[PDB]
Amino acid sequence: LKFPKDFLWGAATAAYQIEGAANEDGRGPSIWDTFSHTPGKVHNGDNGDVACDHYHRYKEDVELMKELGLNAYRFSISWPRILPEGEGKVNQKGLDFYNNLIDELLENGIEPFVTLYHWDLPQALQDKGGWENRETVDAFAEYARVCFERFGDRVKYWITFNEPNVFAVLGYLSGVHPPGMKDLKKAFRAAHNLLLAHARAVKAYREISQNGQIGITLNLSPVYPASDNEEEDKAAAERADQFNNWFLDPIFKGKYEHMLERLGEQIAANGGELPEITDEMEILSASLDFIGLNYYTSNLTDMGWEIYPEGLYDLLKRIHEKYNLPIYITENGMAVDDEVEDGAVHDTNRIDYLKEHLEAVHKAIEEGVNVRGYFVWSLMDNFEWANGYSKRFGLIYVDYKTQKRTPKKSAYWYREVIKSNGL
Ligand code: HEM
Numbered sequence: 001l002k003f004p005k006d007f008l009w010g011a012a013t014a015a016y017q018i019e020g021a022a023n024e025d026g027r028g029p030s031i032w033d034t035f036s037h038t039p040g041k042v043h044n045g046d047n048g049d050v051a052c053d054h055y056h057r058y059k060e061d062v063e064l065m066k067e068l069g070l071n072a073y074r075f076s077i078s079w080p081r082i083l084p085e086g087e088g089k090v091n092q093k094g095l096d097f098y099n100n101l102i103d104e105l106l107e108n109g110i111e112p113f114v115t116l117y118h119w120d121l122p123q124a125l126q127d128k129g130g131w132e133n134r135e136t137v138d139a140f141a142e143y144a145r146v147c148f149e150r151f152g153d154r155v156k157y158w159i160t161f162n163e164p165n166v167f168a169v170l171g172y173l174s175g176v177h178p179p180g181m182k183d184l185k186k187a188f189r190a191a192h193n194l195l196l197a198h199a200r201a202v203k204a205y206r207e208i209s210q211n212g213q214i215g216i217t218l219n220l221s222p223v224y225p226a227s228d229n230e231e232e233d234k235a236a237a238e239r240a241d242q243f244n245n246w247f248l249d250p251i252f253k254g255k256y257e258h259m260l261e262r263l264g265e266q267i268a269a270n271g272g273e274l275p276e277i278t279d280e281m282e283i284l285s286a287s288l289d290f291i292g293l294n295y296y297t298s299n300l301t302d303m304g305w306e307i308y309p310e311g312l313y314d315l316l317k318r319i320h321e322k323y324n325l326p327i328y329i330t331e332n333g334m335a336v337d338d339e340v341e342d343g344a345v346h347d348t349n350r351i352d353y354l355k356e357h358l359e360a361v362h363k364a365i366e367e368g369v370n371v372r373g374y375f376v377w378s379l380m381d382n383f384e385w386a387n388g389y390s391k392r393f394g395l396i397y398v399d400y401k402t403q404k405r406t407p408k409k410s411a412y413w414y415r416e417v418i419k420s421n422g423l
Pocket residue numbers: 161164165168191192193194195196198216218219220221222243244247248253254256284287288322323
């Protein structure tokens with residue numbers, strides 16, 4: 001099973017999950033700094049102040065990427081590390097770090113695959129409403145333009161938002177993620193501003209006219225756990241179904257030109273309050289060079305062992321057949337209760353997970369689906385949001401007391417997969 005000629009072999013991370021240095025070098029706080037320092041919001045009281053200390057250890061981490069032989073590396077830029085208040089003064093040391101990361105990746109032949117927004121909205125913007133406030137759209141447009149001007153000369157692949165469908169549900173409907181709302185009308189309002197923000201970032205990208213591609217990331221198969229009181233999960237599940245069904249409308253499913261109008265009219269229905277739209281609709285008519293898919297499991301509770309690589313194949317066909325755009329598997333991986341035993345981590349079940357999902361990807365590719373890349377989640381164990389560090393997704397084990405990286409068995413297997421360009 002060989003893969004296309006210039007296929008992207010990579011792994012993915014996100015800024016707040018690995019970087020650390022949360023309160024150093026001019027970085028402003030994100031809502032996840034606020035959230036993880038509030039009692040009872042994150043497992044075991046974990047936070048990402050230190051995380052993997054990737055901010056300080058990136059050269060060692062890139063060296064391990066080179067040992068794995070990664071074509072590309074997907075990461076996110078920390079918005080409050082570039083703009084501590086989300087807008088205005090640019091943090092110089094924050095630019096230096098990402099400029100250094102990008103040069104170090106290119107020096108070793110790893111292509112940056114850069115997410116603008118991976119959920120670390122600057123708290124200052126959240127103080128005045130976050131995505132409920134149209135000014136956050138203004139700030140995301142400026143912040144997107146800033147990364148395009150400082151880094152766009154070396155980054156070829158950009159992602160505006162990572163899973164805006166998941167963030168909307170978790171942060172505005174079930175309230176398990178910041179800003180912790182359980183309100184459907186607020187979620188539609190935030191989704192609307194998120195839509196404008198994406199289009200204005202896409203607009204800003206084409207005005208700078210760099211020869212690269214910009215897209216979005218979606219998790220069309222989201223799975224949410226069962227809390228510990230069923231009444232709220234019922235109310236959160238019912239709010240989520242109303243929100244998801246709205247975006248899965250049979251006649252206007254992927255047509256985001258009409259989605260913005262219907263959304264603003266639906267906002268106008270219950271609340272009104274809708275400001276002018278410059279040209280976003282004609283941007284959202286064709287807003288993507290590629291679509292990134294984040295696949296972990298399928299919706300059809302689990303016992304623990306069930307993997308659904310057949311569902312990733314099914315998703316790949318139907319997305320390809322309906323939207324006819326290049327597809328990147330921007331995230332795929334499995335959490336395992338990993339331990340280090342005599343310098344090794346035998347995560348063979350993770351090897352079986354990735355192996356089965358890759359032959360599903362190869363099946364889609366053989367039937368014409370234009371899959372251009374694959375990224376394991378994650379490159380290393382990291383801060384798994386509200387689960388804290390209790391969930392290890394990495395190809396590389398991180399011992400958080402010593403910050404030592406130990407490549408798991410899955411890392412050596414993946415190196416052989418990349419070297420063969422297939423299975
Ligand atoms: C503000 C940003 C966005 C939000 C909040 C959002 C929201 C959603 C939601 C809730 C779903 C359904 C999730 C599920 O399947 O359970 C969805 C599906 C989808 N979204 Fe969006 N979306 C956004 C941007 C976009 C854009 C800009 C595009 C493409 C130009 C896009 C393409 C799709 C596609 C292809 C699907 C799958 C629809 C299908 O089943 O045919 N999304 N989105």
